[PDB]
From Swiss-Prot:
Protein known as: Galactose oxidase
Catalytic activity: D-galactose + O2 = D-galacto-hexodialdose + H2O2
Disulfide bonds: C18-C27, C515-C518
InterPro entries cross-referenced by the UniProt entry: FA58C, Gal_Oxase/kelch_b-propeller, Gal_Oxidase_central_sf, Galactose-bd-like_sf, GO-like_E_set, Ig-like_fold, Ig_E-set, Kelch_1
Protein role: Catalyzes the sterospecific oxidation of primary alcohols to the corresponding aldehydes. The biologically relevant substrate of the enzyme is not known as the enzyme exhibits broad substrate specificity from small alcohols through sugars to oligo- and polysaccharides.
Length: 639
């Protein structure tokens, strides 16, 4: 089940309009209060008109609308379940504009929801594009519109939230498909739960940013239930998904062919582990006692060329453990791993002790000191994030988290870690005065300008509960060493939530829940459009365009020559991310040093060290004098 974000509006003076309505199944039979009666479109004697079908509401007066609900027919018949839909709002009743919520709903008889940002309106409209099984009809038992307590206009220069993307599943895990631009999402064996899994099945869903179509799929070929995994993009351009409910399995996703290929089994059975792509294109993973048993799980490496998993027992998991109250079951989870120089992997936390991991031979480990500052020694920060915003200078920003996984208070702790050569202890200082709001179970992404977008979370970590939420997002600008509060949202994004950077420069934020009978399931996602895409008037600014590229595939140390339509100031390369349970080891940014050739032609060099410039797919963004970025050009880096 799910829950709305507002309170129900009285339907006593409502006037409804429909495109088609049968005798006995009228248009007003959706607002009467009876769970057994329903509105239904023309069938039988009146013919069978195909979708789009529309339902328009007139609330007589202006209300502060923040969502709607749709209860299907409860008579056991499938005829009329709404699949693809669109929600519109208006003040006049003729000019509707752009949709506040669009997407697809699951094929069942449960109550469906569309939760969006507060916007004052008198007229509400629900358009049913398709039927769940592809039939000509549309039916609704009960339709309600919800309102917020008050409305406050969004502050200029602090971004905008919206629109909402309705999904058939709860996206607990996600990744961007580089070659197509789509957002691949997955849950478990079911759309709303994970417990009591038979194994061998994962339900996936994808969203296209250009078309707006949401299409679901069922993956059984890999014999893996991909809930609670370790995700990494290898050097061969394939997404390596490891463990979880089927603790020993590995699944590979190829973006070019849009298919799932079976991978070889791991040496050790894991769950809730973090995996990281190395300098040679290989994938390293360590720990993970979330599933497959509770014991000492040391490191292991995946080779994409030979299709094998090899154990590295001397790469000890013992110095990276937290002092969690639940023991080893939670202490080796969600490691802040980063692929670095000469096959090494840096562990920034969540534990107080930071370590260097080596992959040559049977593996090795060395102490990198404690995560600290002049404010003292930093405690254990489970489910806190770690983002590499400047890979050239080895800059990592760590923030949030709590001492224990569950039933523990979060802190405002924030640090800057500067990486050098493997084996040396890095310099650690405090990032400004810390976060504005203490948060755990939060997610983050690196933006084109070097800034880090932080959103969601809760003050006290209690899984499957939406208690003490943080609605206000934060942005960290490194040049000024300052945190900035952005415009707040209305949907709670706690445990099982994700955040990914879209090729168009915007942020995809969704998920939260996945507990079955709970009312905390979020079958949606929201889009955040940052300040850099807006001008002085508050409208969408003109974005510069990359007209030509010399090559789409480059090697480490090689040069690329581009051509633009206007003058640019800065340029950056961002690696495509993957997200689940606050972990994102794939994302990183490289600031580019440009050479002006003249006539809007620029040249740059991709770093020679493959530990800085990790092999895989990257996003090319160029910024003008106003700071407005372009859309991303997909560049593949090899070694
Ligand atoms: Cu989980
Ligand atoms: Na009814």
């Amino acid at each position: 089940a799910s829950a709305p974000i507002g309170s129900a509006i009285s339907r006593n003076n409502w006037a409804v309009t429909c495109d088609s309505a049968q005798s006995g199944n009228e248009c007003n039979k959706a607002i009467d209060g009876n769970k057994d009666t329903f509105w239904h479109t023309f069938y039988g004697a009146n013919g069978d008109p195909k979708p789009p079908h529309t339902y328009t509401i007139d609330m007589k007066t202006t209300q502060n609308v923040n969502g709607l609900s749709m209860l299907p027919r409860q008579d056991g018949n499938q005829n009329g379940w709404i699949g693809r839909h669109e929600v519109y709002l208006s003040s006049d009743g003729t000019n509707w504009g752009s949709p506040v919520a669009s997407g697809s709903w699951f094929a069942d008889s449960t109550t469906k929801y569309s939760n969006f940002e507060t916007r004052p309106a008198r007229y509400v409209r629900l358009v049913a594009i398709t039927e769940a099984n592809g039939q000509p009809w549309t039916s609704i038992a009960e339709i309600n519109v919800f309102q917020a307590s008050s409305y406050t206009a969004p502050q200029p220069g602090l971004g905008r939230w919206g629109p909402t993307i309705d999904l058939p599943i709860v996206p607990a895990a996600a990744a961007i498909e580089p070659t197509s631009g789509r957002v691949l999402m997955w849950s478990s064996y079911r759309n709303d739960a994970f417990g009591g899994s038979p194994g061998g099945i994962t339900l996936t869903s994808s969203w296209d940013p250009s078309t707006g179509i949401v299409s679901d799929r069922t993956v059984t070929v890999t014999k893996h239930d991909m809930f609670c995994p370790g995700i990494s993009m290898d050097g061969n351009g394939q997404i390596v998904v490891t463990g979880g409910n089927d603790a020993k399995k590995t699944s590979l996703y190829d973006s070019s062919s849009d298919s799932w290929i079976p991978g070889p089994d791991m040496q050790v059975a894991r769950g809730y582990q973090s995996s990281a792509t190395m300098s040679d294109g290989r994938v390293f993973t360590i720990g993970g006692s979330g599933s497959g048993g509770v014991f000492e799980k040391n490191g292991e490496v995946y080779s994409p060329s030979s299709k094998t998993w090899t154990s590295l027992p001397n790469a000890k998991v013992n110095p990276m453990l937290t002092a969690d109250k639940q023991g080893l079951y939670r202490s080796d989870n969600h490691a802040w791993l980063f692929g670095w120089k000469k096959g090494s992997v840096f562990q920034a936390g969540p534990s107080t002790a930071m370590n260097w991991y080596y992959t040559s031979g049977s593996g090795d480990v060395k102490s990198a000191g404690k995560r600290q500052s002049n404010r003292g020694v930093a405690p254990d920060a489970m489910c806190g994030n770690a983002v590499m915003y400047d890979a050239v200078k080895g800059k990592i920003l760590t923030f949030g988290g709590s001492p224990d996984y569950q039933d523990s208070d979060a802190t405002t702790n924030a640090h800057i870690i500067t990486l050098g050569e493997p084996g040396t202890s890095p310099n650690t200082v405090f990032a400004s005065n810390g976060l504005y709001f203490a948060r755990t179970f939060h997610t983050s992404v690196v933006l084109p300008d070097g800034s880090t977008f932080i959103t969601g979370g809760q003050r006290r970590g209690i899984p499957f509960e939406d208690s003490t939420p943080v609605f206000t997002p934060e942005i960290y600008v490194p040049e000024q060493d300052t945190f900035y509060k952005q415009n707040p949202n209305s949907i709670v994004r706690v445990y099982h939530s994700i955040s990914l950077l879209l090729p168009d420069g915007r942020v995809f934020n969704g998920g939260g829940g996945l507990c079955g009978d709970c009312t905390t399931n979020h079958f949606d996602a929201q889009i955040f459009t940052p300040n850099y895409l807006y001008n002085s008037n508050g409208n969408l600014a003109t974005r510069p365009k990359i007209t030509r590229t010399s090559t789409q595939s480059v090697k480490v140390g090689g040069r690329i020559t581009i051509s633009t339509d206007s003058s640019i100031s800065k340029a950056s390369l961002i690696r495509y991310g993957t997200a689940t349970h606050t972990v994102n080891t794939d994302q990183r940014r490289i600031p580019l040093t440009l050479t002006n050739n003249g006539g809007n032609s620029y040249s740059f060099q991709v770093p020679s060290d493959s530990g800085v410039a990790l092999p895989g797919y990257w996003m090319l963004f160029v910024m003008n004098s106003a700071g407005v970025p372009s859309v991303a050009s997909t560049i593949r880096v090899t070694q």
